[PDB]
Write a protein that binds this ligand. Structure first.
Ligand SMILES: [Ca+2]
Length: 352
């Protein structure tokens, strides 16, 4: 089963010949992947030597709790993270229930990587790209059922006044197909890029069944390409939501928006506005803005908000197979399926 409910089609390390390993720490994960690059003779194999399923059982609550008590001390520290570079054999990193990490997972030039059941929070090194999850030049990546959090707050005097904490899930480069699903993202200022610059356009990404709460912006900040966002619960968005730029196209369907400022917009460039197809969300017309506390603001540069709440473009036929529940059902049920310790459970119409 390579079915992710989105553009990514991968089973990760859960394939034939997979080697199961238990990592009790960050360093263990590093050592396991490194050992996975060697053949029977001890020589390195490009792409990796065999598939891997790593169960992370470590717990870094101590680090997380101390950081939560002193958020402004995090940005200047060294960033902490496990890099998965040029590993194409298939790899799955799944956290054990009760495990936690104060380090990120950085994926570079890999493919067929699945990250599940990881509770990652309050990472250090926001000023040095301390992302929780980074997907760079990596197709077929599935980020599912994780809890990514920090504090939706900017400390004074941080570089660019935007580095107190880095992102939850930054995607860039040739990460052509990615599925970000069933994640509980809360207390994050910059949630995630979909393109690192005006030139880094493209990719086909699906965000489904995510539960966003108390987040400022970038859900995602899209640069070109296609984005399918369905069955997500967006609540307490304090800056802007999906920002569709550089002529990107988005299909926004069956989502629940509430207490959100600029939930769907195209701003900051002043040109080449992206488009959106809106359908089945709890909001159906401008009259609903008051009902669900949806606020809109302007930008100093030319922008387009979805304040008329109408579709501004088209969207190709969704390649994959999927079936969304109603917006109401995500509002009612989602918080129980999103995140860690839910045994990777999925929300189906049956449960509505
Ligand atoms: Ca980043």
């Amino acid at each position: 089963a390579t079915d992710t409910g989105g553009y990514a089609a991968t089973a990760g390390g859960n394939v034939t010949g997979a080697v199961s390993k238990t990592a009790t720490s960050m360093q263990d994960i590093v050592n396991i992947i490194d050992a996975a690059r060697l053949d029977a003779n001890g020589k390195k194999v490009k792409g990796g030597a065999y598939p891997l399923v790593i169960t992370y059982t470590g717990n870094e609550d101590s680090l997380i709790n101390a950081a939560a008590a002193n958020i402004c001390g995090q940005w200047s520290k060294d960033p902490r993270g496990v890099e998965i570079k040029e590993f194409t054999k298939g790899i799955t990193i799944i956290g054990a229930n009760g495990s936690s990490a104060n380090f990120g997972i950085w994926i570079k030039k890999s493919s067929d990587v699945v990250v599940q059941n990881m509770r990652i929070g309050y990472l250090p090194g926001g000023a040095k790209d301390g992302d929780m999850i980074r997907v760079d030049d990596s197709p077929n990546v599935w980020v599912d059922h994780n809890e990514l959090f920090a504090a939706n707050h900017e400390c004074d005097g941080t570089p660019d006044n935007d580095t107190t904490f880095e992102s939850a899930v930054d995607i860039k480069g040739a990460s052509n197909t990615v599925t970000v699903s069933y994640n509980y993202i809360h207390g994050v200022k910059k949630v995630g890029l979909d393109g690192s610059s005006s030139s880094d356009t493209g990719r086909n990404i699906t965000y489904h069944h995510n539960y966003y709460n108390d987040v400022n912006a970038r859900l995602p900040l899209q640069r070109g390409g296609l984005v399918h966002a369905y069955n997500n619960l967006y609540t307490n968005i304090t800056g802007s939501g999906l920002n569709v730029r550089q002529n990107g196209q988005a299909l926004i369907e069956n989502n629940w928006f509430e207490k959100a400022i600029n939930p769907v917009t195209s701003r900051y460039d002043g040109k080449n506005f992206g488009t959106w197809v809106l359908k089945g969300n709890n909001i159906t017309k401008p009259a609903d803005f008051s009902t669900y506390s949806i606020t809109w603001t302007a930008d100093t540069k030319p922008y387009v908000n979805a304040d008329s709440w109408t579709s501004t473009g088209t969207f190709p036929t969704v390649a994959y197979n999927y079936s969304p529940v109603s917006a109401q059902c995500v509002k009612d049920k989602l918080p129980g399926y999103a995140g860690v310790g839910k045994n990777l459970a999925t929300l189906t119409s049956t449960a509505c």
